[PDB]
């Protein structure tokens, strides 16, 4: 049991891939966010969503699929 579980959710419709999802510092102060270009629930609506903590803070539409 080496992997301490933190959060398990199922309503977050996050259909990203292993390459369009990256975490880094985005406002300094040593608080890393995670930015992901998420597709539509099917792949119709490209939406950029960033995650801080485990609550969604900003999702905004994107021209085309990242």
């Amino acid at each position: 049991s080496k992997w301490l579980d933190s959060l398990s959710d199922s309503m977050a419709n996050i259909h990203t891939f292993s390459a369009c999802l990256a975490l880094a510092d985005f406002h300094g102060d040593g608080e890393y966010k995670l930015a992901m270009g998420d597709l539509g629930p099917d792949g119709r609506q490209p939406r950029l969503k960033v995650l801080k903590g485990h609550t969604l803070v900003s999702q905004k539409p994107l021209p085309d699929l990242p």
């Binding site: 080496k2 992997w3 301490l4 579980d5 933190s6 959060l7 398990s8 959710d9 199922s10 309503m11 977050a12 419709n13 996050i14 259909h15 990203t16 891939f17 292993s18 999802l21 990256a22 975490l23 880094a24 040593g30 608080e31 890393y32 995670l34 629930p41 995650l51 801080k52 903590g53 485990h54």
Partner: protein, 67 residues
């Protein structure tokens, strides 16, 4: 710990961390997982965030005490 190991998000509802040849820290998920990320998310040097093929999010924090 200088551990730089490749992961694997298998379709049988599990994820197994792979070093050169050995398996370790294999985990389970309620559904097969399509994307995994390991880094300093939040404020922990050992965060791993994983997204289910059906949606949802699973965030796991690795303890530092690894006839």
């Amino acid at each position: 710990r200088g551990l730089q190991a490749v992961m694997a998000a298998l379709a049988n509802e599990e994820v197994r961390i792979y070093h050169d040849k050995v398996l370790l820290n294999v985990i389970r998920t309620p559904e097969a997982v399509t994307s995994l990320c390991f880094g300093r998310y939040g404020r922990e040097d050992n965060t791993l965030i994983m997204t289910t093929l059906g949606g949802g999010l699973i965030i796991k924090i690795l303890k530092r005490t690894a006839k």
